[PDB]
mmCIF file of C-alpha atoms and ligand atoms in Angstrom:
data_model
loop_
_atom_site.group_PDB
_atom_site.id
_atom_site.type_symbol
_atom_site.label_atom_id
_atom_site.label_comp_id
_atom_site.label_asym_id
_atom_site.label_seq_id
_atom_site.Cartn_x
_atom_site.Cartn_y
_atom_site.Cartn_z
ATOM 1 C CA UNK K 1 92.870 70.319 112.206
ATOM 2 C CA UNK K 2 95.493 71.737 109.389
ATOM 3 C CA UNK K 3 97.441 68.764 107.479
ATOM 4 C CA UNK K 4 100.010 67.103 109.453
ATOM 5 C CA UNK K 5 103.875 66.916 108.796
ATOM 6 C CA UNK K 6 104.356 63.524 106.965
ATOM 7 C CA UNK K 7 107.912 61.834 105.272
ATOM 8 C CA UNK O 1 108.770 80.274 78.065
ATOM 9 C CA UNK O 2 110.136 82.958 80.354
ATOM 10 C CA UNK O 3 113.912 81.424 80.386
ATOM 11 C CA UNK O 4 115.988 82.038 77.307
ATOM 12 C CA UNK O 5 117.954 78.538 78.511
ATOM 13 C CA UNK O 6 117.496 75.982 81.099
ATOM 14 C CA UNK O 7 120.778 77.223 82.956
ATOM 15 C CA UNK O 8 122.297 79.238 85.378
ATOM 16 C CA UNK O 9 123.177 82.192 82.880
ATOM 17 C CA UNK O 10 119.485 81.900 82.019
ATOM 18 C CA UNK O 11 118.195 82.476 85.716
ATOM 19 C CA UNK O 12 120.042 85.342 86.101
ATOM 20 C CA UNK O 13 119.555 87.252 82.814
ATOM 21 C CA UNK O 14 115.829 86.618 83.731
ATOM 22 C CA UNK O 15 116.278 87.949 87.418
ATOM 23 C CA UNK O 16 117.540 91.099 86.302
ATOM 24 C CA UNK O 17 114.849 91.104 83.505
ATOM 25 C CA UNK O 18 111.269 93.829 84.533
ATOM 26 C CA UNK O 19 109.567 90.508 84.509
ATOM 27 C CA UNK O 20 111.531 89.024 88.085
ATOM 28 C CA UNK O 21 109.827 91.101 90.667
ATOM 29 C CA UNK O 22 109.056 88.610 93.206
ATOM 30 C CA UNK O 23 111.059 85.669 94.379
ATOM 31 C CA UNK O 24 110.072 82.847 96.977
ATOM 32 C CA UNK O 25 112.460 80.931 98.380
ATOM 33 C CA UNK O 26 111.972 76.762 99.193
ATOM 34 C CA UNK O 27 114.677 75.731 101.684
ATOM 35 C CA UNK O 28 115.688 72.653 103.652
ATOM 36 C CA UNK O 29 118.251 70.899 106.027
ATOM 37 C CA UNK O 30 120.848 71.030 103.032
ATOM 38 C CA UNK O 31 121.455 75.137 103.489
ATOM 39 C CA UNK O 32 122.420 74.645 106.644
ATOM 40 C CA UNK O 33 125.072 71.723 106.912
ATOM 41 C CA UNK O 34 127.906 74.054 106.195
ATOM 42 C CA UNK O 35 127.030 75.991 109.519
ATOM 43 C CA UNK O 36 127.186 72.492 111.184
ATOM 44 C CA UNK O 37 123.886 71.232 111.622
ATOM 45 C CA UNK O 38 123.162 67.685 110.039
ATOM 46 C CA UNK O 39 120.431 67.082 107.455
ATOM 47 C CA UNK O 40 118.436 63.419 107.180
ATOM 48 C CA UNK O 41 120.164 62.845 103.934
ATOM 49 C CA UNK O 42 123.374 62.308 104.739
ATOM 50 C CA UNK O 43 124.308 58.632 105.615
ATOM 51 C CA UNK O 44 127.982 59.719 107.200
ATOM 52 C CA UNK O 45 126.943 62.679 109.534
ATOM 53 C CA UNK O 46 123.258 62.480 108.996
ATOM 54 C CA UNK O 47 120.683 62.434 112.071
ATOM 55 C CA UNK O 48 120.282 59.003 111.655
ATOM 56 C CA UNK O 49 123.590 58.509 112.327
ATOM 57 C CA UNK O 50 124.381 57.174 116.368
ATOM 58 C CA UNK O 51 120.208 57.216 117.226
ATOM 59 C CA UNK O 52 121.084 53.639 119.506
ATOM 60 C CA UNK O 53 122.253 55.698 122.207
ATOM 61 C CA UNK O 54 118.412 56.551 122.730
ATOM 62 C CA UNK O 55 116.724 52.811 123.023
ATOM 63 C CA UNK O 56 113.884 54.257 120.399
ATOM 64 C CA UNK O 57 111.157 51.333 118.909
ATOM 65 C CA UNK O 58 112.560 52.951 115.312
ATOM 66 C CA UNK O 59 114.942 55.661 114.301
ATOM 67 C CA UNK O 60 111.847 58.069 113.159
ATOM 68 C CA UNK O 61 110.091 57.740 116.872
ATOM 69 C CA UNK O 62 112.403 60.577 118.233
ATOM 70 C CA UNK O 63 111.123 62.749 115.650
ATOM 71 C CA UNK O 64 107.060 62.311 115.951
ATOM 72 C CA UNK O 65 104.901 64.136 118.488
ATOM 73 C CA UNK O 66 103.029 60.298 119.754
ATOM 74 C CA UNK O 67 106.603 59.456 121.035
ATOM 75 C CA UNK O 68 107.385 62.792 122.306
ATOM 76 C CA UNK O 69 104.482 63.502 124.361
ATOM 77 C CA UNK O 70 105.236 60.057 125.427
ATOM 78 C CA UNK O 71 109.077 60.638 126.717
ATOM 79 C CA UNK O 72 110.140 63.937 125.615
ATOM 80 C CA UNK O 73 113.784 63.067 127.232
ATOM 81 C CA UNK O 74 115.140 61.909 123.917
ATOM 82 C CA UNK O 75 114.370 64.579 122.049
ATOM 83 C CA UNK O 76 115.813 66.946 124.615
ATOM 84 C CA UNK O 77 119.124 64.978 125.117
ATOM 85 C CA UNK O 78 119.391 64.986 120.979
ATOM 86 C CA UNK O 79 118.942 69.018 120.913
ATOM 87 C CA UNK O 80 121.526 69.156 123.225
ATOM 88 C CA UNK O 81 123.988 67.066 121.494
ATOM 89 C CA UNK O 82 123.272 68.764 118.187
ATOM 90 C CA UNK O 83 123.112 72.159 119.366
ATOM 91 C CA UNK O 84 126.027 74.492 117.574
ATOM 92 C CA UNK O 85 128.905 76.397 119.467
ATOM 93 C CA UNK O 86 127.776 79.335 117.388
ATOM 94 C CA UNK O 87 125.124 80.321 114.834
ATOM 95 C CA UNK O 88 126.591 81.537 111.706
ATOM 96 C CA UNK O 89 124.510 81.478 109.035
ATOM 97 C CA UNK O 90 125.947 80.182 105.221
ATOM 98 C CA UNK O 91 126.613 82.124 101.972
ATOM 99 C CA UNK O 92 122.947 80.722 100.943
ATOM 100 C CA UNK O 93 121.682 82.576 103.979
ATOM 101 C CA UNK O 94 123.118 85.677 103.168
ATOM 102 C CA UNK O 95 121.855 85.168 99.486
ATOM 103 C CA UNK O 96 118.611 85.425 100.906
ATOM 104 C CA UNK O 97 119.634 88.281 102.686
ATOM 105 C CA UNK O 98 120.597 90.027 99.545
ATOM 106 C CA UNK O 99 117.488 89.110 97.935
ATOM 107 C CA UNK O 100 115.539 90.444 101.256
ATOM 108 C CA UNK O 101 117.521 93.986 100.522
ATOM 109 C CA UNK O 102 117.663 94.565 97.076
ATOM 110 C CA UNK O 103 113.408 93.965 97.162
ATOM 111 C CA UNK O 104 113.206 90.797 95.475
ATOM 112 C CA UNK O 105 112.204 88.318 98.246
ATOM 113 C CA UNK O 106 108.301 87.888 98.342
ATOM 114 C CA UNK O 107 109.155 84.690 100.950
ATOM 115 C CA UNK O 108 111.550 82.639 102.319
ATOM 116 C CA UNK O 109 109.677 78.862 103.476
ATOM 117 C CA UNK O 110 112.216 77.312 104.684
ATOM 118 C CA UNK O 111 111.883 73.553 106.885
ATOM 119 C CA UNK O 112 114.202 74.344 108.674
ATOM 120 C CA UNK O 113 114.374 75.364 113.032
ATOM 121 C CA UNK O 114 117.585 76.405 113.599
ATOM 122 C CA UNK O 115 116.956 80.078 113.620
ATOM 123 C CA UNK O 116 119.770 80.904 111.132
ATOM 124 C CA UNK O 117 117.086 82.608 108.777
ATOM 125 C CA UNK O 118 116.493 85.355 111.318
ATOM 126 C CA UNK O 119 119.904 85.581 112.340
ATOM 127 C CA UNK O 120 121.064 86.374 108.235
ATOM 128 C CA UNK O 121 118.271 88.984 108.942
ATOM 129 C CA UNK O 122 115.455 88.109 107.165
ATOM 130 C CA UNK O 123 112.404 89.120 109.733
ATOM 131 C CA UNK O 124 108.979 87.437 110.750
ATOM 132 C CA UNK O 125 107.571 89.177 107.758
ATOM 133 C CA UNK O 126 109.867 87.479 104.760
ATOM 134 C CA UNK O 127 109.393 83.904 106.276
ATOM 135 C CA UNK O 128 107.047 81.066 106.763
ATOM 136 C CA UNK O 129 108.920 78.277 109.414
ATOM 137 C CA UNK O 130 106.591 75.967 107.951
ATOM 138 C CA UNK O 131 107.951 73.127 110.661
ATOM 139 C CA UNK O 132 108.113 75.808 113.080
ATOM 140 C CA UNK O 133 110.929 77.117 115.306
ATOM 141 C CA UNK O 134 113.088 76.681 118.596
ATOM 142 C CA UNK O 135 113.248 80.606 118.095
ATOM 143 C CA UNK O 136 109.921 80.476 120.793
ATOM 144 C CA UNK O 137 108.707 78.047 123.311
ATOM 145 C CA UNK O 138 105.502 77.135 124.654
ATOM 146 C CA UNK O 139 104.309 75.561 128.079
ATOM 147 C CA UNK O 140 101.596 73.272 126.517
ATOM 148 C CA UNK O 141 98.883 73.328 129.059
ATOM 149 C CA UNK O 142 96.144 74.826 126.816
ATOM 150 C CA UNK O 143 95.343 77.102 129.811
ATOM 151 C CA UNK O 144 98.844 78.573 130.265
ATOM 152 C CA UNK O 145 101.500 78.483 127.041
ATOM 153 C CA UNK O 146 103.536 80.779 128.701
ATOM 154 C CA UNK O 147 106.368 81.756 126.232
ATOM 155 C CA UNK O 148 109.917 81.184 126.479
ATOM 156 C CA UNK O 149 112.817 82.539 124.612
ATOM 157 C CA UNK O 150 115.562 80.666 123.068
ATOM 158 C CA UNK O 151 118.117 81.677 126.040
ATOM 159 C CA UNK O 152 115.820 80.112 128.389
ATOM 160 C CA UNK O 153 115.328 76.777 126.435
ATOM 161 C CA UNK O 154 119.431 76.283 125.942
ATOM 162 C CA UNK O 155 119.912 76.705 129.108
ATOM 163 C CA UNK O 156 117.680 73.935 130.385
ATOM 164 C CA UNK O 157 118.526 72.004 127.353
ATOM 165 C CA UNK O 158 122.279 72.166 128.521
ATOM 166 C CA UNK O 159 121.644 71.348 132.228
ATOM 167 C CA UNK O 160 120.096 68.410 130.972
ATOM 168 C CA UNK O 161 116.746 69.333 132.962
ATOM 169 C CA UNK O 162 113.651 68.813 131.257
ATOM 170 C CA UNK O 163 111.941 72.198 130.494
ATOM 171 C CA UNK O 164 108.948 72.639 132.969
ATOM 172 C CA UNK O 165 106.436 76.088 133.027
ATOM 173 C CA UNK O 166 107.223 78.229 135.597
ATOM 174 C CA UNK O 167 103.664 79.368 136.076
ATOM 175 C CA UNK O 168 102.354 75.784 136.052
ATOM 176 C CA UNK O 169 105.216 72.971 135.840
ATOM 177 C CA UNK O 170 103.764 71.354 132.882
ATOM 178 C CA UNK O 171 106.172 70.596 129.619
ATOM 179 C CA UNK O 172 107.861 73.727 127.578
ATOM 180 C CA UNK O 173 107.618 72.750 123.822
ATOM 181 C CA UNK O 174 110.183 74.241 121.374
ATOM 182 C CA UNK O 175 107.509 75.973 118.990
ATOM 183 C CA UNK O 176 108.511 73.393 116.381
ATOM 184 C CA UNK O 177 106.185 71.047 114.171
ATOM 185 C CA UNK O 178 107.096 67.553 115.130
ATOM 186 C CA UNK O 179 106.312 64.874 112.592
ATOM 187 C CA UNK O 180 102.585 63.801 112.921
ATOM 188 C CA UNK O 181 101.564 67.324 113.689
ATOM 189 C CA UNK O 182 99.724 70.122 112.188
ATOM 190 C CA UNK O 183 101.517 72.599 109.844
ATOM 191 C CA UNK O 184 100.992 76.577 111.495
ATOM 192 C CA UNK O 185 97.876 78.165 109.783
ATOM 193 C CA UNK O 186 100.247 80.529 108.798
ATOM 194 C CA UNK O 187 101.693 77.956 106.263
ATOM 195 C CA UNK O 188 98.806 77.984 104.533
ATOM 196 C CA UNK O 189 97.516 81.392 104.928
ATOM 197 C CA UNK O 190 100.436 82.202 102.904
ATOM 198 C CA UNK O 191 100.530 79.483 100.734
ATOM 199 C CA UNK O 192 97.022 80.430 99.369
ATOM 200 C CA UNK O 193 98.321 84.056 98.156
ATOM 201 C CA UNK O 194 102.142 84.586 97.672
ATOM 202 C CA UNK O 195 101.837 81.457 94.648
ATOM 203 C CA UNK O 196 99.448 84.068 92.926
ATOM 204 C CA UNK O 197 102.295 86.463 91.813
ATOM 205 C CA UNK O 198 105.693 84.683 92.127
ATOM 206 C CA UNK O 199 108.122 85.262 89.256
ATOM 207 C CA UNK O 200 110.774 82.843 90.724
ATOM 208 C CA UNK O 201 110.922 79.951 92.297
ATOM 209 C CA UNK O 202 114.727 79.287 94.460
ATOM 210 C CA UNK O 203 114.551 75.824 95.855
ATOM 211 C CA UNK O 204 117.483 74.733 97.863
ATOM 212 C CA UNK O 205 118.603 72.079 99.990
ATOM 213 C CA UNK O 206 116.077 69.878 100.473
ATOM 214 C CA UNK O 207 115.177 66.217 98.736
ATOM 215 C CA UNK O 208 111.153 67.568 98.477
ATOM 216 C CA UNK O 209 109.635 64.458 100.248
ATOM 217 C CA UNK O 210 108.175 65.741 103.744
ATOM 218 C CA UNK O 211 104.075 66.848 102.874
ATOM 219 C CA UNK O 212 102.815 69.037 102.914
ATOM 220 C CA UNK O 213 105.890 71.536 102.233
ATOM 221 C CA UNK O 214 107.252 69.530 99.530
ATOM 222 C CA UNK O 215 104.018 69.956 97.297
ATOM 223 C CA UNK O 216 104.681 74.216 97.256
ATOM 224 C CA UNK O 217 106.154 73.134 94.410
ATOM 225 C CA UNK O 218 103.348 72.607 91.950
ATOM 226 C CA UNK O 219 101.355 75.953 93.528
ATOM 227 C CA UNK O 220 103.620 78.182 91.456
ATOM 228 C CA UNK O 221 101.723 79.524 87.718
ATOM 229 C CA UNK O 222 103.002 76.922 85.201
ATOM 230 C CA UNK O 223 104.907 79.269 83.557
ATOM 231 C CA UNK O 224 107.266 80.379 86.782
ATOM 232 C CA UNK O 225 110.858 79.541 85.978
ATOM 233 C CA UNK O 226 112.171 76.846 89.249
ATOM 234 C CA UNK O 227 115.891 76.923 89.891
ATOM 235 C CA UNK O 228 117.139 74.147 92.111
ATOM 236 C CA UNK O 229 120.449 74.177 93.711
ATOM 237 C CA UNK O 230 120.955 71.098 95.640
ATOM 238 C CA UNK O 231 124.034 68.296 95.715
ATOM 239 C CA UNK O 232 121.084 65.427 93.914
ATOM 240 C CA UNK O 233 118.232 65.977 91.513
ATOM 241 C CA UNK O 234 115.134 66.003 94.103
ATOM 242 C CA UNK O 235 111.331 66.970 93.034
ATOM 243 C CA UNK O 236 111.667 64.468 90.043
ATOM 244 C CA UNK O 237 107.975 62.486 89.670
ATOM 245 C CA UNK O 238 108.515 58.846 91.190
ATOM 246 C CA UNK O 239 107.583 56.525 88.175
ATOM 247 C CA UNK O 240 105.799 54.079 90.421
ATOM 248 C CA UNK O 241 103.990 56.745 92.812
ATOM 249 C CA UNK O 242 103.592 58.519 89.327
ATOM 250 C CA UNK O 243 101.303 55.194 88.267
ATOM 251 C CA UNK O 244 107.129 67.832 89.712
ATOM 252 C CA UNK O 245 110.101 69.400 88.224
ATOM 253 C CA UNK O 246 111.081 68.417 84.684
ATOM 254 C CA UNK O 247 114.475 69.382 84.381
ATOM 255 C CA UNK O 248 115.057 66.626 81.620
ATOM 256 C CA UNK O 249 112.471 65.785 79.089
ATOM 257 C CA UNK O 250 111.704 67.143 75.852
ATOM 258 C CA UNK O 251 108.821 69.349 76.889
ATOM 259 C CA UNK O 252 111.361 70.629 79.728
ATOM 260 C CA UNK O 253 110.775 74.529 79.523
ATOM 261 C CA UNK O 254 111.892 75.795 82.368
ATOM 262 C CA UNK O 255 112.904 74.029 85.580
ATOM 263 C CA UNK O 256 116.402 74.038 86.036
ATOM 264 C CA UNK O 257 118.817 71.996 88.601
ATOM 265 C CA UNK O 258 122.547 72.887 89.251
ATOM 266 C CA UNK O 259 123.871 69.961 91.166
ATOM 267 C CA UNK O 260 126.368 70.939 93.932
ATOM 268 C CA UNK O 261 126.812 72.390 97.142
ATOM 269 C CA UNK O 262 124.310 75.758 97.951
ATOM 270 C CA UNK O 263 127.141 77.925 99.291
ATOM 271 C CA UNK O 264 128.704 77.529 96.103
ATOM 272 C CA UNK O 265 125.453 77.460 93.828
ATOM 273 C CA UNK O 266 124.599 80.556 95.303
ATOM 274 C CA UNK O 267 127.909 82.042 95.144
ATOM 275 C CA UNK O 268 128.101 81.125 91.051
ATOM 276 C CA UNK O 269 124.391 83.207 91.001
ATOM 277 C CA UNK O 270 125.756 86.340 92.590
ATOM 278 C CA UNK O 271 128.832 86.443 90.258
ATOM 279 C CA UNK O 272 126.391 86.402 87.743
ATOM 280 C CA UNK O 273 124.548 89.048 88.936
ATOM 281 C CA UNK O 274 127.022 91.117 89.751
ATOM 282 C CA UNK O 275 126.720 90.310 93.785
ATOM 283 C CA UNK O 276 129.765 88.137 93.945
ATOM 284 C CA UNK O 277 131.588 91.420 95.914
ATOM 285 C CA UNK O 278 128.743 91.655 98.081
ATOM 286 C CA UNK O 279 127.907 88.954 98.955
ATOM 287 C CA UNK O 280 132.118 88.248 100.354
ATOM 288 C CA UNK O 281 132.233 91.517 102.157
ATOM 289 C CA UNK O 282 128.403 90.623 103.703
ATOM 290 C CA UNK O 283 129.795 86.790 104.884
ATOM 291 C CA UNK O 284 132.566 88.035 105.959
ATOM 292 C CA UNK O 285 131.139 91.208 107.734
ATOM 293 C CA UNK O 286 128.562 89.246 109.958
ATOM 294 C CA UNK O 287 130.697 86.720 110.368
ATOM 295 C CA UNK O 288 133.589 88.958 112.265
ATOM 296 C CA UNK O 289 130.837 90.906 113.749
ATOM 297 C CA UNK O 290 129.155 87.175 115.694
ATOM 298 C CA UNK O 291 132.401 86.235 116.348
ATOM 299 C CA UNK O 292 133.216 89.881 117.767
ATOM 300 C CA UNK O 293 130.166 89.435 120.529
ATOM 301 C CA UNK O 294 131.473 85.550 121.707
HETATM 302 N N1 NAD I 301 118.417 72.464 110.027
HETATM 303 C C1 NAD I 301 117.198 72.003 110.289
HETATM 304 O O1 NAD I 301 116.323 72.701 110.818
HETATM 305 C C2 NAD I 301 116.902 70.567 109.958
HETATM 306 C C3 NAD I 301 117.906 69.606 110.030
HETATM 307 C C4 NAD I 301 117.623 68.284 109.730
HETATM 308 C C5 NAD I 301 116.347 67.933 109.361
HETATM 309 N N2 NAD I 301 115.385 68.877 109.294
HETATM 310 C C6 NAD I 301 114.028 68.383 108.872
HETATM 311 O O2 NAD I 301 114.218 67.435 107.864
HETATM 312 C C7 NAD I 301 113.017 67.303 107.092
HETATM 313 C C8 NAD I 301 113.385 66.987 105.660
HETATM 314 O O3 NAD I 301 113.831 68.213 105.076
HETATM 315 P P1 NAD I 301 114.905 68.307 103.915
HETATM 316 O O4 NAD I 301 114.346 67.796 102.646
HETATM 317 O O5 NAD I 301 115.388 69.701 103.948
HETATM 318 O O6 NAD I 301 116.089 67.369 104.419
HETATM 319 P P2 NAD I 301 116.792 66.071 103.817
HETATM 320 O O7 NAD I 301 117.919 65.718 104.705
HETATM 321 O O8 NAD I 301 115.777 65.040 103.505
HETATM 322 O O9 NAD I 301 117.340 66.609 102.425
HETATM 323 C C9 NAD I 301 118.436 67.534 102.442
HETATM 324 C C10 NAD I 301 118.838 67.740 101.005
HETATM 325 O O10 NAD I 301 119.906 68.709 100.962
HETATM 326 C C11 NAD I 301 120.986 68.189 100.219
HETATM 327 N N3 NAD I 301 122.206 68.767 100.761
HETATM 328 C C12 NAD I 301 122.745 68.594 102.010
HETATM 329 N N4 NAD I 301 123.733 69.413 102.283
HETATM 330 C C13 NAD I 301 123.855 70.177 101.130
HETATM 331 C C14 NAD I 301 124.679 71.269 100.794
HETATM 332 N N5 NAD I 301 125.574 71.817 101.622
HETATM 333 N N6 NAD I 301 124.503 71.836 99.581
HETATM 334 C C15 NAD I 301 123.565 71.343 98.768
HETATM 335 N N7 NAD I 301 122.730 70.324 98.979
HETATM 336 C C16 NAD I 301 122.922 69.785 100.185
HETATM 337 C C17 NAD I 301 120.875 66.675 100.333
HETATM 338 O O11 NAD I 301 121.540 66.083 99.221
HETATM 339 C C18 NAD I 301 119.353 66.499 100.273
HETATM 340 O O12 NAD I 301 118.835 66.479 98.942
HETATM 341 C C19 NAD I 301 112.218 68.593 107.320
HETATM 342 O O13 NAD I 301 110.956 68.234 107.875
HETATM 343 C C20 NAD I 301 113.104 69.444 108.261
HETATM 344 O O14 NAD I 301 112.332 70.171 109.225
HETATM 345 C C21 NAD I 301 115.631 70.167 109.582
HETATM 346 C C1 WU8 I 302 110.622 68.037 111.309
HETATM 347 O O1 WU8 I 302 111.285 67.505 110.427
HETATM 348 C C2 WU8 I 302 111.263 68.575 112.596
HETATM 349 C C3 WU8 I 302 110.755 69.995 112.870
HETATM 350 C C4 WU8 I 302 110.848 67.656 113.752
HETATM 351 C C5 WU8 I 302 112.783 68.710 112.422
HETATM 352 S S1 WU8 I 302 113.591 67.093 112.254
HETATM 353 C C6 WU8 I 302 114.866 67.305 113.525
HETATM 354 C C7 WU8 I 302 115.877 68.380 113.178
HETATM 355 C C8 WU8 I 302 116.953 68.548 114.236
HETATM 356 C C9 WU8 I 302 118.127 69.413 113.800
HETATM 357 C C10 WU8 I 302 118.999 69.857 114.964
HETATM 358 C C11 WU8 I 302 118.210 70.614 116.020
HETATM 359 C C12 WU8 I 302 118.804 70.571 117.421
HETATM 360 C C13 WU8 I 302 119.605 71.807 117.789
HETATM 361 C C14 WU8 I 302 119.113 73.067 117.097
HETATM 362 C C15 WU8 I 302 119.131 74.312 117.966
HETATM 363 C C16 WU8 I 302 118.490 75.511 117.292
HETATM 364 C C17 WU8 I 302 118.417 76.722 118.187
HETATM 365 ZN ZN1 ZN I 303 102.427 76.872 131.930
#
């Protein structure tokens, strides 16, 4: 899995 | 350095210099608030702003995909309370556009979902929707994702039915990265070859805190100018997370922020390069011409 959407 | 001062004059004596051949564009939430769609930012009009309504554990819930694929009705009631009358895209759009058609633009990454990229007429090609898009839907039974075009998505969005597959019945997704979820491969596909040979970096409207889009930043060569054009100072290093730009210090050499709206930041950069004419009769142009087909 690609890096995830974090704030 | 590559900027013969940290200003707007500079920027655009270097655009028009041989040097300035490619330009990517960073954009956020804050190019689109003038076409009426609300950034996290703002505390007055922000989406944050009337989130009770929805019972949520906390505010960020109807924004991550654990929650959604949980109860997807919040999300869906929130599109349809946000969703515009009309989609005009800003004067910072149509920037871009200008960019796009005098053969500067190597890339537009923009955060943003709202479509108003494409609709300024930039195509597939110029952009990465690094969070995605509600341009495109997707049943998400890995078996089916049958797509779904925008017209069909507003319209169950607006009769308040939650979008099911017609081949299947399972959930349509708006093809949109929720928080919590995997960036497209397309993101960094991109990523990994248009920071080899960008002469200019245009970042505007967005504070630079969501990962990993914020961090395009630092893939640019060191010596690539960075304009920002935002209302606050964003992609500053934190000093305690620091335990980014450098539009300040004494070794500042060539990041520079112009503080204001982007409509009118990107207005100021036209004049400058003698677009200011253009770039009123363009506005104004597609703006008669959208309001000509409603
Ligand atoms: N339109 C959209 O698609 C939309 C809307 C809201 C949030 N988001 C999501 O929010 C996340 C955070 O992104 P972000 O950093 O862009 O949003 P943000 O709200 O955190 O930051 C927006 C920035 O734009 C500035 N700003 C707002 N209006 C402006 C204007 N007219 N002119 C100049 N500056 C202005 C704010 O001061 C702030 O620095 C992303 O993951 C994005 O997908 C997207
Ligand atoms: C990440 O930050 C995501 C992709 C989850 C965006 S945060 C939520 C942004 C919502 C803005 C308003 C969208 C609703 C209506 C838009 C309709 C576009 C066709
Ligand atoms: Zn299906």
């Amino acid at each position: 899995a690609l890096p995830k959407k974090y704030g | 350095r590559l900027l013969d001062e940290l200003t707007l004059e500079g920027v655009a004596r270097y655009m028009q210099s041989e040097r300035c051949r490619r330009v990517i564009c960073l954009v956020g939430a804050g190019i689109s608030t003038s076409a009426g769609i609300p950034d996290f930012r703002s505390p007055s009009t922000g989406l944050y702003d009337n989130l009770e309504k929805y019972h949520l554990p906390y505010p960020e819930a109807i924004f991550e995909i654990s929650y959604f694929k949980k109860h997807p009705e919040p999300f869906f009631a929130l599109a349809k309370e946000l969703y515009p009358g009309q989609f005009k895209p800003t004067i910072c759009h149509y920037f871009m556009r200008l960019l796009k058609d005098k053969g500067l633009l190597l890339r537009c990454y923009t955060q943003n979902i709202d479509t108003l990229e494409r609709i300024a007429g930039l195509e597939q090609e110029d952009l990465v929707e690094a969070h995605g898009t509600f341009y495109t839907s997707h049943c998400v039974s890995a078996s089916c994702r049958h797509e779904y075009p925008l017209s069909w998505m507003k319209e169950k969005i607006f009769s308040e039915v939650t979008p099911k597959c017609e081949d299947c019945q399972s959930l349509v997704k708006p093809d949109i990265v929720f928080f919590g979820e995997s960036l497209p491969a397309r993101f960094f596909s991109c990523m990994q070859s248009d920071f080899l040979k960008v002469d200019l970096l245009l970042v505007m409207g967005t504070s630079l805190q969501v990962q990993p889009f914020a961090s395009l930043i630092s893939k640019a060569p060191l010596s690539t100018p960075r304009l920002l054009i935002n209302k606050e100072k964003a992609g500053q290093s934190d000093p305690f997370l620091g335990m980014g730009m450098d539009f300040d210090s004494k070794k500042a050499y060539r990041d520079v922020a112009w503080l204001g709206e982007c409509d009118q930041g990107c207005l100021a950069l036209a004049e400058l390069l003698g677009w200011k004419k253009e770039l009123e009769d363009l506005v104004r142009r597609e703006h008669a011409s959208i309001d000509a087909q409603s």
